[PDB]
């Protein structure tokens, strides 16, 4: 109980990092689009 019992192209796991990086790029691109519209 002290040590032994005490534990701690599918596009779900392979492209999950693809999904996170593409989502971050989309958020950054939308932020740059709003900065470009608010500037000019």
């Amino acid at each position: 109980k002290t040590w032994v019992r005490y534990q701690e192209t599918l596009t779900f796991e392979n492209m999950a990092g693809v999904f996170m990086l593409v989502a971050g790029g989309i958020v950054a691109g939308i932020f740059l689009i709003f900065i470009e519209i608010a500037y000019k």
Binding site: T9, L10, T11, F12, M15, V18, F19, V22, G25, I26, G29, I30, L32, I33, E36, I37, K40
Partner: protein, 273 residues
């Protein structure tokens, strides 16, 4: 019981017939050199590109529609800041995927062309993954087996999967001791699923009264070479199995046995075996 009760209790001399080797039989008697290399396997019934659900599986399709709605909202915002891309932005975003659409005049606000380039790079890497999946389709050519071996997740509990199964060995033999020297839980799931006769277990596998039977691999290959119907192809050849040999067991201290080993080492190096 049997030949071990005859040799250890000094009623017989040796066992020329087949006899497995484990720890306690290495303790009570002495085995010879392995004159044969055998293995075990599991015989099952194993009786006999349509549509792909690999890239999206009706879950990422919602995210495609969300990105279409976002690009349409940004196009409406640019048109408010500033030409049919108010409600028809779905056709303009998903129409530039397959690079033969009519070129629609983009606005001069440096907004549409950047996200079209980003979606085009996403389409290039998506076509790369699509051609990669179509090329990896060449790797498989037959359906995989139901039981890959002893390392299957079905042997934990068949309630985890949808079909339940069953498996048995010989009653009170060396196979049960080889199980209990490796897995007591396998003996626990096998005790309720016992059987009586090996040929009766084969008839039960044919008629569907048994799902799996553990036996020697080479003898099952010999029986599949003479099988009526030819619907038994043995899964593996000892990869996830015991794969032990057989020797000749004499009493501890027999002087003939060494000389017998000579005959064994005469029977191998001449093609006689």
């Amino acid at each position: 019981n049997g030949m071990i009760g005859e040799v250890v209790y000094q009623r017989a001399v040796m066992a020329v017939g087949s006899l497995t080797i484990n720890e306690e039989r290495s303790e009570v008697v002495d085995f010879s050199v392995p004159f044969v290399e055998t293995g075990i396997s599991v015989m099952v019934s194993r009786s006999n590109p349509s549509a792909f659900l690999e890239p999206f599986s009706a879950s990422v399709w919602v995210m495609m529609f969300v990105m279409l709605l976002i690009v349409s909202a940004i196009a409406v915002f640019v048109f408010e800041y500033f030409s049919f891309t108010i409600g028809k932005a779905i056709w303009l975003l998903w129409g530039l995927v397959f690079n033969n659409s009519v070129p629609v005049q983009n606005p001069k606000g440096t907004t549409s062309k950047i996200m079209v380039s980003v979606w085009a790079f996403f389409a290039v890497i998506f076509l790369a993954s699509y051609t990669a999946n179509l090329a990896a389709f060449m790797i498989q050519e037959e359906f995989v087996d139901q039981v890959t071996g002893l390392s299957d997740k079905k042997f934990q509990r068949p309630h985890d999967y949808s079909p339940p199964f069953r498996f048995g060995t010989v009653p009170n033999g060396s196979t049960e001791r080889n199980i209990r020297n490796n897995y007591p839980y396998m003996h626990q799931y096998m005790t309720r699923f016992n059987q009586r006769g090996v040929e009766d277990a084969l008839v039960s596998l044919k008629t569907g009264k048994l799902d799996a039977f553990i036996y020697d691999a080479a003898v099952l290959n010999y029986k599949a070479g003479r099988d009526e119907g030819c619907k038994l192809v043995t899964i593996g050849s000892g990869y996830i199995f015991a794969t032990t040999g057989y020797g000749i067991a004499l009493q501890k201290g027999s002087p003939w046995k060494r000389q017998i080993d000579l005959a064994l080492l005469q029977f191998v190096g001449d093609g006689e075996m």
